[PDB]
Amino acid sequence: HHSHMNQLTQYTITEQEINQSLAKHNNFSKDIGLPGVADAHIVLTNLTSQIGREEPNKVTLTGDANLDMNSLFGSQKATMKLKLKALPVFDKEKGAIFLKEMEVVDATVQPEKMQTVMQTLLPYLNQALRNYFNQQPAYVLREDGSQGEAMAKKLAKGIEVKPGEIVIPFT
Ligand code: NA
């Protein structure tokens, strides 16, 4: 019965909850690189997370990107599979979890000639990613959801990353 808080001492956010939230909040569509030389517009979709399985305190993400790579002489479409890693950090003020310092762990690009361009543009993509996800939270605690979530917002004593899920202690 919904009148009883599942958990009384903490609140838990699963990989699946983070994924659905990202699916809502992730609208990453940015320009990366050097206009007129190697300048890509990149849209990131389908971000799926893995919580705290490698580095105990870090999160991993897989996603797809579509790119339009541009130069003064033309453009070419590219697609990309990415693996990313980030550091979840809780902002008490906003009652929100941010995936900070996001960077590309591995990437595969098609077509082939776009492979070397993207390797060069990697640090630009890293910049766009961490600027985007440093300010767009991955998860925001609401007051009009479960009572547990309401209580996390009010009491949250930071977060703790465990295998498979993010825990927000009330204590
Ligand atoms: Na940027």
Curated annotation (Swiss-Prot):
<keyword id="KW-0472">Membrane</keyword>
<keyword id="KW-1003">Cell membrane</keyword>
<keyword id="KW-0449">Lipoprotein</keyword>
<dbReference type="GO" id="GO:0005886">
    <property type="term" value="C:plasma membrane"/>
</dbReference>
<keyword id="KW-0564">Palmitate</keyword>
<dbReference type="InterPro" id="IPR010835">
    <property type="entry name" value="DUF1439"/>
</dbReference>
<keyword id="KW-0732">Signal</keyword>
<protein>
    <recommendedName>
        <fullName>Uncharacterized lipoprotein YceB</fullName>
    </recommendedName>
</protein>
<dbReference type="Pfam" id="PF07273">
    <property type="entry name" value="DUF1439"/>
</dbReference>
